[PDB]
Amino acid sequence: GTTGERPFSDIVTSIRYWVIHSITIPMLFIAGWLFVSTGLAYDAFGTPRPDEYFTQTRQELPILQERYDINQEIQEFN
Amino acid sequence: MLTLKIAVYIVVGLFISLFIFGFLSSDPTRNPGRKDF
Amino acid sequence: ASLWEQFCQWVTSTNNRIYVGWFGTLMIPTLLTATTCFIIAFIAAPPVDIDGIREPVAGSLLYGNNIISGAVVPSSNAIGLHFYPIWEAASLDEWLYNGGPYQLVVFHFLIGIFCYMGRQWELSYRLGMRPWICVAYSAPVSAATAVFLIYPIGQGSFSEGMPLGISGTFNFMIVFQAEHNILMHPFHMLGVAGVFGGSLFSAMHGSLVTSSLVRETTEVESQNYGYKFGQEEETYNIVAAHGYFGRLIFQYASFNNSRSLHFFLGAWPVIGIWFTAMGVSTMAFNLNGFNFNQSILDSQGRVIGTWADVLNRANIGFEVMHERNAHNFPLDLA
Amino acid sequence: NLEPIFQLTFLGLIVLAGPAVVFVLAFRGGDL
Amino acid sequence: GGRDLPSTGFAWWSGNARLINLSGKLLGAHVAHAGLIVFWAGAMTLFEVAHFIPEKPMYEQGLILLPHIATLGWGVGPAGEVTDIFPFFVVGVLHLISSAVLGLGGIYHALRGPEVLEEYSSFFGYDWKDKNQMTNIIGYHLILLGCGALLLVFKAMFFGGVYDTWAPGGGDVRVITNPTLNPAIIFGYLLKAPFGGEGWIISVNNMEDIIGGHIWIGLICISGGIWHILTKPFGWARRALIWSGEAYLSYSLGALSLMGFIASVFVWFNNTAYPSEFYGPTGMEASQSQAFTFLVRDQRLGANIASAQGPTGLGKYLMRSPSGEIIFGGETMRFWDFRGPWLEPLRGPNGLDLDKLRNDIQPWQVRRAAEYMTHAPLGSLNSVGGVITDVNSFNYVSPRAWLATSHFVLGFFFLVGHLWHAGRARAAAAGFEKGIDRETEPTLFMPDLD
Amino acid sequence: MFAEGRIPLWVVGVVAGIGAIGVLGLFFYGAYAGLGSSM
Amino acid sequence: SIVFQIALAALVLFSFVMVVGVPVAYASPQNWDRSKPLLYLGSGIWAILVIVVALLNFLV
Amino acid sequence: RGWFDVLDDWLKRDRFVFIGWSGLLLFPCAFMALGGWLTGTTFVTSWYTHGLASSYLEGANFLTVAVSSPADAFGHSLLFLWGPEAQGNLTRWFQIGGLWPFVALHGAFGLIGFMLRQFEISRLVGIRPYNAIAFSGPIAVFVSVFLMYPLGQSSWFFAPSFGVAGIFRFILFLQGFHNWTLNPFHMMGVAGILGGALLCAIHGATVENTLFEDGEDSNTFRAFEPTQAEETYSMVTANRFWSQIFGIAFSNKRWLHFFMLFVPVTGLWMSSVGIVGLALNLRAYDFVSQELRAAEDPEFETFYTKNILLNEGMRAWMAPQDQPHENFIFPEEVLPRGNAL
Amino acid sequence: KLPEAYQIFDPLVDVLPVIPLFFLALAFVWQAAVGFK
Ligand code: CLA
Ligand code: CLA
Ligand code: CLA
Ligand code: CLA
Ligand SMILES: CCCCCCCCCCCCCCCC(=O)OC[C@H](COP(=O)(O)OC[C@@H](O)CO)OC(=O)CCCCCCCCCCCCCCC
Ligand SMILES: CC1=C(/C=C/C(C)=C/C=C/C(C)=C/C=C/C=C(C)/C=C/C=C(C)/C=C/C2=C(C)CCCC2(C)C)C(C)(C)CCC1
Ligand SMILES: CC1=C(/C=C/C(C)=C/C=C/C(C)=C/C=C/C=C(C)/C=C/C=C(C)/C=C/C2=C(C)CCCC2(C)C)C(C)(C)CCC1
Numbered sequence A: 001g002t003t004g005e006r007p008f009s010d011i012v013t014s015i016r017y018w019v020i021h022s023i024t025i026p027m028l029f030i031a032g033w034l035f036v037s038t039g040l041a042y043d044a045f046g047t048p049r050p051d052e053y054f055t056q057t058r059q060e061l062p063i064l065q066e067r068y069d070i071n072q073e074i075q076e077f078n
Numbered sequence B: 001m002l003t004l005k006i007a008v009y010i011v012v013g014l015f016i017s018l019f020i021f022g023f024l025s026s027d028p029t030r031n032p033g034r035k036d037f
Numbered sequence C: 001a002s003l004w005e006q007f008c009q010w011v012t013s014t015n016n017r018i019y020v021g022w023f024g025t026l027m028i029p030t031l032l033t034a035t036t037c038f039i040i041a042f043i044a045a046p047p048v049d050i051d052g053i054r055e056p057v058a059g060s061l062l063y064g065n066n067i068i069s070g071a072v073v074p075s076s077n078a079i080g081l082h083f084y085p086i087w088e089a090a091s092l093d094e095w096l097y098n099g100g101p102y103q104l105v106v107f108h109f110l111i112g113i114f115c116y117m118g119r120q121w122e123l124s125y126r127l128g129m130r131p132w133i134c135v136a137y138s139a140p141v142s143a144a145t146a147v148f149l150i151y152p153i154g155q156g157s158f159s160e161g162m163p164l165g166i167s168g169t170f171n172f173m174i175v176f177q178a179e180h181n182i183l184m185h186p187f188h189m190l191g192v193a194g195v196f197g198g199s200l201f202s203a204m205h206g207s208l209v210t211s212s213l214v215r216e217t218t219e220v221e222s223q224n225y226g227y228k229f230g231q232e233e234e235t236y237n238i239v240a241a242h243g244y245f246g247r248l249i250f251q252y253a254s255f256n257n258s259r260s261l262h263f264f265l266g267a268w269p270v271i272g273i274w275f276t277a278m279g280v281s282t283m284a285f286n287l288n289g290f291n292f293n294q295s296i297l298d299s300q301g302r303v304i305g306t307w308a309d310v311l312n313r314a315n316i317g318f319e320v321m322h323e324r325n326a327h328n329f330p331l332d333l334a
Numbered sequence D: 001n002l003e004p005i006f007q008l009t010f011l012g013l014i015v016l017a018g019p020a021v022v023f024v025l026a027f028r029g030g031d032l
Numbered sequence E: 001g002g003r004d005l006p007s008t009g010f011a012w013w014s015g016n017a018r019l020i021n022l023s024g025k026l027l028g029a030h031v032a033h034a035g036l037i038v039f040w041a042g043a044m045t046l047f048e049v050a051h052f053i054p055e056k057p058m059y060e061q062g063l064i065l066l067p068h069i070a071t072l073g074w075g076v077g078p079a080g081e082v083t084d085i086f087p088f089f090v091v092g093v094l095h096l097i098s099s100a101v102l103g104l105g106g107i108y109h110a111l112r113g114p115e116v117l118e119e120y121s122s123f124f125g126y127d128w129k130d131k132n133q134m135t136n137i138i139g140y141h142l143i144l145l146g147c148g149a150l151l152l153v154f155k156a157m158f159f160g161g162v163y164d165t166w167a168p169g170g171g172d173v174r175v176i177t178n179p180t181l182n183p184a185i186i187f188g189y190l191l192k193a194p195f196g197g198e199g200w201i202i203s204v205n206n207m208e209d210i211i212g213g214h215i216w217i218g219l220i221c222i223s224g225g226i227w228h229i230l231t232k233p234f235g236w237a238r239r240a241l242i243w244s245g246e247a248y249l250s251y252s253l254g255a256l257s258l259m260g261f262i263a264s265v266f267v268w269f270n271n272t273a274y275p276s277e278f279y280g281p282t283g284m285e286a287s288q289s290q291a292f293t294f295l296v297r298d299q300r301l302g303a304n305i306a307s308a309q310g311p312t313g314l315g316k317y318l319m320r321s322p323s324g325e326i327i328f329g330g331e332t333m334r335f336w337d338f339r340g341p342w343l344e345p346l347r348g349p350n351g352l353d354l355d356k357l358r359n360d361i362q363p364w365q366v367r368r369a370a371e372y373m374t375h376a377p378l379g380s381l382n383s384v385g386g387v388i389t390d391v392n393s394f395n396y397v398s399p400r401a402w403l404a405t406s407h408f409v410l411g412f413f414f415l416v417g418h419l420w421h422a423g424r425a426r427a428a429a430a431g432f433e434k435g436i437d438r439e440t441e442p443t444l445f446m447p448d449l450d
Numbered sequence F: 001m002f003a004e005g006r007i008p009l010w011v012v013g014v015v016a017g018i019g020a021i022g023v024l025g026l027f028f029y030g031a032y033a034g035l036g037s038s039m
Numbered sequence G: 001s002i003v004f005q006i007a008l009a010a011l012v013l014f015s016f017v018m019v020v021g022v023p024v025a026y027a028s029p030q031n032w033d034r035s036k037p038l039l040y041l042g043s044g045i046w047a048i049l050v051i052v053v054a055l056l057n058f059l060v
Numbered sequence H: 001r002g003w004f005d006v007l008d009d010w011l012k013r014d015r016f017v018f019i020g021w022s023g024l025l026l027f028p029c030a031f032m033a034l035g036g037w038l039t040g041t042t043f044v045t046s047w048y049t050h051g052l053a054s055s056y057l058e059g060a061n062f063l064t065v066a067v068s069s070p071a072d073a074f075g076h077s078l079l080f081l082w083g084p085e086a087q088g089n090l091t092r093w094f095q096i097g098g099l100w101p102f103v104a105l106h107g108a109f110g111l112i113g114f115m116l117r118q119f120e121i122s123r124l125v126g127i128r129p130y131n132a133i134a135f136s137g138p139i140a141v142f143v144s145v146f147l148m149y150p151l152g153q154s155s156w157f158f159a160p161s162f163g164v165a166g167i168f169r170f171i172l173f174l175q176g177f178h179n180w181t182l183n184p185f186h187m188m189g190v191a192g193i194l195g196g197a198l199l200c201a202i203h204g205a206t207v208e209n210t211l212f213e214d215g216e217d218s219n220t221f222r223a224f225e226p227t228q229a230e231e232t233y234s235m236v237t238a239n240r241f242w243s244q245i246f247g248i249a250f251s252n253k254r255w256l257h258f259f260m261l262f263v264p265v266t267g268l269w270m271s272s273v274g275i276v277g278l279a280l281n282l283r284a285y286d287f288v289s290q291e292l293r294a295a296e297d298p299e300f301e302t303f304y305t306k307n308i309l310l311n312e313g314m315r316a317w318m319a320p321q322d323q324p325h326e327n328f329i330f331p332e333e334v335l336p337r338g339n340a341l
Numbered sequence I: 001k002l003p004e005a006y007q008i009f010d011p012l013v014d015v016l017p018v019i020p021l022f023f024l025a026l027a028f029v030w031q032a033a034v035g036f037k
């Protein structure tokens, strides 16, 4: 029945497991929190913040139309 | 129209009376298990 | 001994080739009536003024329809929820014009399928079976009652019930989406989960049982001849099927008890279809699917579209063109 | 505002109240 | 008392089935659940009061219990304006405290009382096979149900009355002094067709009819209670029915399914016992209001609303019903059986009267029609008002929509419960609820079908 | 908690389920506040 | 004013003590001779608190 | 011991997660596809490809997020991260919708790896590979819908977006532009899927209600053991029941289960053939006899012609927003609409 | 709104309706503690 690995019900009912995870799982939570709250996700993925959907010189949808020079196209779209 | 209405009322009432009187006529005992109740 | 008891024994007989029963004494007349009127109306009914605006819709084969476009058209919006039998019409032609065949077919059909569910219980009781096949059949029954009865009641007209045809069903679905946003309703999503998962699990069950068949035939004949009707023994290796499926995903995701597996196979699409029947039955009262239209705004306040906004553009295009001549006021209140 | 603070504190007390009962009856040996 | 599956044969997900033959614990489960019902009533009323703007309509604020209290004539005046916040709070406080009492009692019987009541008293001890004791309990519950119906009658007749939406001068809390004791009217409400224009009992249109029916219901229930206490079940009833706890549960499930369906239709269609000042307009009311609103607007623009023909050839504002009554035009032709206190002033003997429409429309009827048309029971699951193509700025779903949808779903799932328990009761009384016996499999002794 | 070196698994389950309910409730709260709330 | 608020806070706190204590005392039978009188007393105390809250509701 | 056979030993161990030779294709590709979808629906916009917000970062919910299709300007460019569009820039690659071919390609190769895993585990366990043959249906659906439909169309833009409301958009788009309900290949798909759901429900209910009394508990689930030889339910009783209820019944267990396989797989294959037709705009859009009549006779109305009008209205009201690269300016007076709405 | 003297415990009133789901889920908590017997 057991393929060789420690059973999960044994693992998650241990003191040492929860000593390691009481730290790892919340601190991964705060790592995702600081990814969003420091604003790094916007710069990493190119997602507009709520005030860069439209700029003062572009009020329409910035639909890409270039096929190869899209970097300059996104730049002049801002 | 009145004749069709009377005929349909009679047919529907006869089938509904059949249904009711059949389920009143010891339908629990019409089973292959224990028919005492 | 008595004539009535002899009739009761014939009615409840398990030796009838088609079981009748007391539910069958209501099922057979209603279903035969609905079948005969549906066939006659689908072939040769004259056009029906479904919207109650003197704009009759040709539904039958003799009036220019094919099989796909043919329908028994729902009764007139002028009738509404009013009971419209033949004897309430001044003539048969008036009855046909106002959509009386739809009311006749739908009412006898709904009684017949409720009696089919009762008859399924009845025969399970006479055969010494467990009784809950009728519970599984109550999910298609609830869906049929939702689209033929409950949605007309909530909308206030039998003209809003699903038409008895293929293209009429498509018309019902498209108008449903434009008005209730059924795709965004989670009960319809649960229904899609029910039918997609039911087909998935049907394919899984069938493929695992066919995969683990015990060798009882040569390579020439069909493998189905490895099973004899009424054999005591199992025709397939469930332990082999479980070993395969608990290595395909992992060990504890696979059923080993066949009874739990078959209860799951019954319960999943039945619960999904129950939920989608209740979704249609609750959009009868205009509790509609999610409205996320203009949910995202920028910091100035301008609307940033999502896929729900494009879906709403499609819904508007479906709505402004539906029943094009029936609306006189700015809002489609029902 | 302090209204979500009080709301979540009342919610926290009531969500802990049940498992506290079950946990006390498990720990002290209740007829569970 | 078995509390595990080896000692009962019921798994944990069927674990309350272990309570079938344990009467005192079963009484405790009931009382504890009753306490849950009264707890929700009290706590939800306190929530609704705490989330109540009384100068705002109740149907605008997602309230379902305050309309019920206001329909009884508590804290309200003419046209449903809330004069006093306190009676709603009192009803909430009373349910919440009685629920504390009921929860203590349910937990006592479920966790410390006699597990079986038949070894303590012959009055509360019940065996499911004992037809006389179960009919006695029917009789007790019937007597108290008749007393509750008479309590509603006492409230409407001797304790300040109820809200009459049809009252002259507008709807108000009025005392019903002449309830209809006529059995013809009361029981011909039962013989009316459950279809358009007749509506069975959903079409009860006046507070006098409701109160007279509740006097009749109280008399019928008290007489039937004394009946089941004084009589044993007759031979036809004993030969037709299954006599077991699961059977009685399934009978009650079928009745509950019926009652949930009827309540959904009742809150959807009736505006007398569910007044539109509290529950909002019905779907029919809002559609007729839209037609009336645009009739009034186009008449103010000089349009001849009688002679105006629409694009289809029917009248744009006024048309004929299939029996010839003068009704509003457009899709609302389907809602021509709608009756409301804002519209009955403009109805003549033949339908909507032209003279009254020409020179008897009051500004309050215009205001009421605009409000009802813009509060039609149409809304997204996330509570976005209007048609589903509307954008997100109107936070509204009608209480009629919520109540009808909920109680239709509950009625369906309780029909499913009836089927599950009626079938299991028959299978268990017949002895094959656990499966087919291999030695005595019944199909194996039957002739072949062909 | 009632054992030697061990936590009851139902305590672990109730803690994990409370956390899952909490993050689901937070995600449903964010439907009515901040971005995507239509206000 | 604040005296009624103190009474209501005492009522909700004693309800918290009762909702902790009632199922524990009804599922601890070996402590029943300890649990039964206090529970009796507790019920009486709870009832008195309800009444005095009502009285202060018509005194405030 | 050769290194290949030693690696074959290690890959096909009996562990918690079986790897196999197929796992080297399945697990990195499925992980890439799933992580790409979760990454796109959490962080990546569709603002420059669609003019839409489609991530949780922008405030969309689980229904309204998608890895949306790339811009129509790219055509059927595979849109590699190192490709001539993105030019190695990960941020530009995210903005131009490169996560869509990333997810779609890795997903397609992961689906290949999964059917290879089905083949490998079926061979190792010693059973027939009918699970892989059944899984041919979903891969046919994925290949026809997410790959050959946009390949037949102008770009990857018109592929379905990997999202809930994006898929709902694709669904409504195919109704309004293709009349996909009217297509008989979709009708066979619908018949197959509803029949598979019917067969699942009916088969489970029949087995659970023809169970043999093989235990003393009301809980019938403990009256089964996997190593038993005899059937847990009565096929004879089930056959007699459905013969008297429905008229016909299954009398062969193996044929029953092959049919439960056959119905939804055949439905998926038939709907895939229809989607292949729709890729080239080869629709069952119209019944020309009824349009010729309706153009000549203004008294002729069917439900088909009403559906045609619905499709026209949807197309005109949706296309400026659904295809913003086209710059469809439809003034309000050209929009088809009925009276008063 | 609530009466003014009862405006101290408005958040508790806000959380009071949901306690039935807490009861329904506590049934599962108790069945987990006793072992789903
Ligand atoms: C309305 C809901 C409801 C009610 C009233 C009951 C009631 C009951 N169930 Mg039950 N049950 C339910 C839902 C409910 N159940 C659900 C949803 C499931 C599926 C998980 C089950 C599965 C189940 C099983 C498997 C069993 C029962 C059993 C029982 C009976 C005794 C319980 C016991 O002895 O152990 C006691 C449990 C505890 C002491 C844990 C503490 C729980 C307490 C009571 C919480 C409530 C206290 C409250 C917070 C205090 C308020 C009081 C006041 C101060 C305000 C009892 C009458 C047993 C039985 O059949 O009896 C022979 C049994 O075997 N049930
Ligand atoms: C449907 C509800 C119900 C039923 C049938 C019972 C039945 C029973 N209880 Mg129980 N109980 C309940 C609810 C119920 N109880 C509630 C809510 C509480 C909390 C207060 C209790 C707390 C309780 C305790 C502590 C005890 C019992 C006991 C008993 C048993 C004997 C009682 C007796 O005959 O003495 C005689 C009966 C009377 C003197 C009748 C007096 C009239 C009542 C009490 C007042 C009227 C009620 C109310 C004001 C009217 C309307 C109700 C309102 C909500 C609308 C009996 C089987 C005893 C036992 O366990 O048996 C050994 C026991 O000691 N019960
Ligand atoms: C909810 C309270 C309640 C309950 C649980 C019962 C329960 C019972 N009663 Mg009782 N009864 C009650 C209230 C109640 N009654 C009241 C309030 C009165 C005063 C009028 C009576 C007067 C009464 C009498 C005279 C008799 C009973 C009898 C019975 C027993 C069998 C009845 C039966 O077989 O049903 C089924 C009924 C039939 C199969 C007959 C056909 C009825 C048709 C099908 C009804 C059509 C309804 C239709 C579908 C719905 C439309 C609504 C409207 C048009 C009617 C049963 C234990 C019988 C008994 O055993 O005596 C002790 C008996 O003879 N009761
Ligand atoms: C008051 C009416 C009533 C009563 C007293 C019973 C009583 C009983 N039923 Mg029944 N049943 C009913 C109505 C009722 N049922 C309805 C309306 C349905 C249709 C859905 C059923 C379908 C049904 C089935 C399929 C079975 C029973 C069974 C049982 C027995 C044990 C069940 C148990 O332990 O609970 C256990 C409770 C749980 C395991 C948890 C249930 C929670 C559900 C699944 C979801 C809750 C949804 C709710 C609205 C809250 C939403 C939460 C969401 C926000 C997350 C028991 C005697 C069993 C039986 O036949 O034994 C004799 C059984 O197999 N019933
Ligand atoms: C308590 C939950 C009950 C809700 C009803 C749904 C379950 C029944 C549906 C089956 C329909 C098909 C009928 C034939 C199928 C058939 O005949 O079933 C047979 C099967 C065998 O049961 P047994 O006879 O061994 O035991 C049941 C009773 O006889 C006594 O326990 O019945 C069950 O398993 C009932 C268990 C339901 C209890 C848990 C199920 C919870 C599922 C729903 C959860 C919510 C879903 C939505 C969430 C998103
Ligand atoms: C048996 C059993 C069970 C059940 C249980 C139950 C069902 C219960 C209950 C219970 C109940 C039913 C309860 C209750 C309560 C209540 C209370 C405790 C109250 C109160 C009060 C107060 C304190 C109030 C206050 C106030 C006022 C005066 C007004 C203002 C506001 C406020 C709120 C502050 C279960 C399932 C778990 C399982 C196990 C066994
Ligand atoms: C309050 C009110 C009112 C009144 C009402 C009344 C007076 C009533 C009643 C009622 C009644 C008085 C009823 C009833 C019922 C009945 C039922 C619901 C039944 C049934 C059935 C059954 C259940 C049966 C079954 C069966 C069969 C079918 C056969 C065989 C045997 C058996 C048993 C199986 C009015 C509207 C005026 C006004 C408003 C309010």
Ligand SMILES: CC1=C(/C=C/C(C)=C/C=C/C(C)=C/C=C/C=C(C)/C=C/C=C(C)/C=C/C2=C(C)CCCC2(C)C)C(C)(C)CCC1
Pocket (backbone or CB within 6 Å): F020, F021, F024, H031, H032, H034, H035, H036, H038, H039, H042
């Ligand atoms: C894109 C890309 C990539 C990849 C990445 C990856 C592969 C990753 C990932 C990732 C992942 C893999 C993520 C994740 C996630 C997740 C989430 C977001 C979750 C969730 C959830 C939830 C919310 C749930 C809830 C619930 C339900 C509903 C059911 C039951 C209960 C509970 C509460 C549990 C690289 C760098 C290569 C390069 C560039 C491109």
Ligand SMILES: CC1=C(/C=C/C(C)=C\C=C/C(C)=C/C=C/C=C(C)/C=C/C=C(C)\C=C\C2=C(C)CCCC2(C)C)C(C)(C)CCC1
Pocket (backbone or CB within 6 Å): D014, D015, D016, D017, D018, D019, F010, F013, F014, F015, F016, F017, F018, G012, G013, G015, G016, G019, I016, I019, I022, I023, I025, I026, I028, I029, I030, I032
């Ligand atoms: C009125 C009032 C009150 C009362 C309250 C009450 C009436 C009570 C209660 C209570 C309760 C009633 C609590 C509870 C709870 C709970 C919970 C927290 C639950 C849950 C959970 C979970 C998470 C679960 C999970 C699971 C599942 C479902 C699956 C398997 C198993 C397990 C366990 C893992 C007070 C005193 C505050 C104060 C005054 C006011």
Ligand SMILES: CCCCCCCCCCCCO[C@@H]1O[C@H](CO)[C@@H](O[C@H]2O[C@H](CO)[C@@H](O)[C@H](O)[C@H]2O)[C@H](O)[C@H]1O
Pocket (backbone or CB within 6 Å): B001, B002, B005, B006, B009, B010, B012, B013, B014, C087, C088
């Ligand atoms: C066994 C079950 C029962 C079967 C036995 C009963 C048979 C049917 C009896 C009812 C017969 C028809 O009942 C009768 O229908 C006619 C329909 O013309 C109604 O008549 C009503 O409508 C007609 C037109 O539709 C009008 O011209 C008439 O002035 C009006 O009264 C009567 O009001 C009703 O008394």
Ligand SMILES: CCCCCCCCCCCCO[C@@H]1O[C@H](CO)[C@@H](O[C@H]2O[C@H](CO)[C@@H](O)[C@H](O)[C@H]2O)[C@H](O)[C@H]1O
Pocket (backbone or CB within 6 Å): A043, A044, A045, H039, H086, H087, H088, H089, H090, H091
């Ligand atoms: C959940 C997954 C997390 C996603 C990963 C997070 C990081 C995303 C990228 C942000 C990093 C910097 O963002 C962008 O990175 C690319 C590499 O792709 C850099 O690009 C640079 O190197 C690449 C590779 O040769 C070439 O295009 C070019 O030489 C130059 O532009 C950009 O100058 C920088 O603007």
